[PDB]
Design a protein around this ligand. Structure first.
Ligand code: HEM
Ligand code: 8ZU
Ligand code: CL
Length: 393
């Protein structure tokens, strides 16, 4: 039989410090039932990995939030990629893979790296800065909207829209209800920018539209795929970079190793994604009765995957609660796993790498010098404010 737990993984108490409850979730069994929301939960690495890698049994087209699209109306038209299963998923996935391809990274790296170096030089002139607003947020804002081909006007709607998207995967708690209440202006802005004439030549948005000539997607699919990048492409990186800086600030020995070998920048970022898991949770819906970790789950049930917990599971990781920039990080599930594994992962890693490279070369110490404030969101883990003093190398 499956253990029933009263833990609310979407409560502010949980967000404030999820680690003890995540252990309780892992140790109760391979599959638990969360009475608060009437969903199954898997918090160990093995089951999270298994669920992610069986999209046939554990589907996405009934939503990857708590809401079951078979029962309730989606809050916005479903994503053609995140909220689709093969074979409908396959061609939109291929388009985004090509738009954000290894070859595409060559076209943006120079500019992304220059912007990272410039940002760190700017911050060093101030010394004492907020590593969230002034760095984790400022840097992606300085490169990603431009890479998308967005106009300047209205960009202030991007972070609010993303906060909404990520809150909306949650249960109908206050965070979700308030986000949806306030959604109209952000939706209006984002939806408008997804149209072809509003996306600058050569940018990711224009490229998605260009693919409508190939037979991979129709012209009416392009705006929703642009919408995907404007939903997933900014706030994720904000929280990833924030995570990495927060790790370096707390683990000075690791900052020193990074300074000594800046080639560790990419793995130092990857390890931060594992360690903090800025994207904490996703759901699937079962398409049949299924046996998972000795437990039987009926058809049409929501299954909550704890990515952050999987990334700290001692059954998989040695010293999971240590930040180690030379850890073998391959296998972590912070970007997911399988057919939906983050299609933007090369952009995320590029941003993280060039920022950590800039810090590695320019900064001697990162010392927290004010109160740290956490930001609460149904799906994202990260900080509201991280006051630090940056000492120049
Ligand atoms: C550190 C930064 C990021 C993290 C931690 C992250 C995390 C994730 C995760 C866990 C998934 C899997 C969702 C699932 O299995 O249902 C995912 C998918 C996705 N991500 Fe990322 N992401 C990041 C950055 C980005 C960026 C920069 C972009 C685009 C520029 C992006 C676009 C997408 C899209 C479109 C999907 C859906 C892919 C599919 O359904 O096939 N993400 N991401
Ligand atoms: C971690 C990224 C989560 C995510 C992925 C895809 C979408 C979308 O296609 O709209 C929105 C959010
Ligand atoms: Cl929308």
């Amino acid at each position: 039989t499956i253990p029933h737990l009263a833990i609310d993984p979407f409560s502010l108490d949980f967000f404030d410090d999820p680690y003890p409850d995540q252990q309780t979730l892992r140790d109760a069994g391979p599959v638990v039932y969360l009475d608060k929301w009437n969903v199954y939960g898997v918090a160990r690495y093995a089951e999270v990995h298994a669920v992610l890698n069986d999209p046939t049994t554990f589907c996405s087209s009934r939503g990857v939030g708590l809401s079951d699209f078979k029962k309730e109306k989606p809050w916005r038209p479903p994503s053609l990629i995140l909220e689709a299963d093969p074979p409908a998923h396959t061609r939109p996935r291929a388009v985004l893979s090509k738009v954000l391809s290894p070859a595409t990274m060559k076209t943006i790296r120079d500019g992304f790296a220059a912007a990272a170096d410039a940002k760190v030089d700017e911050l060093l002139q101030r010394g004492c800065i907020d590593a969230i607003a002034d760095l984790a947020e400022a840097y992606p804002l300085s490169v990603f909207p431009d890479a998308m081909g967005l106009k300047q006007e209205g960009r202030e709607h991007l972070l609010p829209y993303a906060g909404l998207v990520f809150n909306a995967f949650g249960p109908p708690n206050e965070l979700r209800q308030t986000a949806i209440e306030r959604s109209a202006p952000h939706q209006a802005y984002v939806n408008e920018q997804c149209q072809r004439p509003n996306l600058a030549p050569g940018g990711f948005g224009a490229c998605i539209h260009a693919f409508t000539d190939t037979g991979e997607i129709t012209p009416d699919e392009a705006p929703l795929l642009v919408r995907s990048l404007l939903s997933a492409g900014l706030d994720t990186t904000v929280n990833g970079i924030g995570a990495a800086v927060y790790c370096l600030a707390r683990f000075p020995g690791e900052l020193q190793r990074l300074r000594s070998d800046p080639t560790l920048a990419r793995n130092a970022f990857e390890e931060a994604v594992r360690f903090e898991s800025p994207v904490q949770t996703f759901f699937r819906t079962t398409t049949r009765e299924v046996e998972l970790g000795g437990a039987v789950i009926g058809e049409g049930e929501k299954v909550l995957m704890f990515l952050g917990s999987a990334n700290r599971d001692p059954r998989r990781w040695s010293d999971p609660d240590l930040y180690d920039i030379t850890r073998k990080t391959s296998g972590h599930v912070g970007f997911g796993s399988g057919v939906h594994m983050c299609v933007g992962q090369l952009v995320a890693r590029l941003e993280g790498e060039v920022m950590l490279s800039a810090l590695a070369r320019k900064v001697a110490a990162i010392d927290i010098d004010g109160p740290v404030k956490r930001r609460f969101n149904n799906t994202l883990r990260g900080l509201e404010s991280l006051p630090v003093k940056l000492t120049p190398a």
